[model samples]
Target: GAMAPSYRVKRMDIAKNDEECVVNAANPRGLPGDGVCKAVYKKWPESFKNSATPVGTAKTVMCGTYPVIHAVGPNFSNYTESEGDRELAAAYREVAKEVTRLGVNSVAIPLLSTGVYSGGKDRLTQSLNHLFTAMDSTDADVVIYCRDKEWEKKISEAIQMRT
Candidate 1:
């Protein structure tokens, strides 16, 4: 029998050709210069500018080569509100589902809402946990890319607790 593709946590920069990637964004227009938006905007400027405010709270954009999953998240100023938490989890779930549907065997996801969204670290950790559990049956190799060592540590700890 074929063993299921395993998910693993990694602390590093996303590789140039990662099969798929998930980036955080905002509805309507994703912020242009900060966090994952920086890369998204640089890669898909026209798409980002032309995107409608995502209906139902979030959106996902798939560009060529990278095939990014751009998910709407709360702005930093409103990070303390609980709504961001729910939206963030929704985004993660959406990405996981998309990857599975697309048959992507490998995926890289950032620590959603932890960057420009600035949702609290505790909340970020909880969201990461949510993502992992939601993606448990995805049957793909999922890599959570942490921007810094601190987040890397937190993510590693959280993943360990899950196992």
Candidate 2:
């Protein structure tokens, strides 16, 4: 329970990776501005075709190769710690629900809000813990992918540094 990583760390275009689905970090209004959101929008112009998806919820859109789950996580820079933790956990749970619903073998989720969204490095513990727990409920293997290599290492180290 204490010496291995939870998710696979692959530094590449998450939109084109081998994972069955990519969970894009998004706002409650379902708008695309953050890193993964921009990439998802670029990959599938049809993403978030519907109206707003509230925070702590996820929206699913199918593409030819792989589906994308737009999971809304709180902007920790704006939210209090408790609020961020709850919403972040819910966001991961929502993604897991979609993965189980789809019954895919693999799914990739970027480190939500731990970017320009100001999740800060401290959020890593919460991020990894919630990510692993939520995903455990699914049958698919969880992979971690991000466009930036620095973040890839950062997340990788966090995983290695913890259970």
Candidate 3:
């Protein structure tokens, strides 16, 4: 009788190990930092880096929904490039990509790029607009948890929102 030897599989995660990619300018939700995506910048003041961006953490369906991507972006009026329609769209794209990487089919996202820095209405609205327009499938539903009613209104105005 003969026994076959088996070895544990090891994969080099490139995308998961890449540096903090520069986010597109004009992101509304807020820049990706220690809070969102668990990504802590290499040079974020040394005093506030976690180095523990949970990638494949447990998937929870909060808000009575499916998988959700909690993305973070830079300030509203500061980070440049995509603004208004283009703003935050890239962030949304990254979120979806991350979900796919995690072997998940559907994802939900909050109004990214809109908080703290230049947040409130205008930024929130823009983030939502970009998120929706950039999404590829109708199967995916983006949820912008408009925290505050006043802030939500501001964001709505940015998109010329009717409701």
- Residue lDDT tens for model 1, 34-138: 655566576566546444445123355556554556566555466446666666667667767767666767777766666655643445666677677667877
Clashes of each: 1, 0, 18
Worst ten in a row by lDDT for model 3: 1-10
State the lDDT of candidate 2 residue by residue for 26-143, as single tens digits: 7777676757787878887676677258888988877675677888888878888888889889999999888888877888788776776655655655677788878765667678
What value of lDDT does candidate 3 attain over all alpha carbons? 0.37
Q: Pick the candidate with the highest lDDT.
A: 2
In angstroms, the error of model 2 at 148 is 4.5
Q: 1-163, model 3: which lDDT tens digit per residue?
A: 0032111111222113222221212112223443323232232222122222222121222222222333445454555434523434655666656544454333324455454544444555455555655554433332233446676556555444333
Best by TM-score: 2
Q: lDDT per prediction?
A: 0.60, 0.76, 0.37
Error of 2 at 47 (Å): 2.0
**Worst lDDT 10-window in candidate 1:** 49-58
Give TM per candidate.
Answer: 0.75, 0.83, 0.43
Error of 3 at 97 (Å): 1.7
Ranking by lDDT: 2, 1, 3
lDDT of candidate model 1 versus the reference = 0.60
> How far is 1's C-alpha from truth in model 3 (Å)?
47
Taking all chains together, the TM-score of candidate 2 against the true structure is 0.83
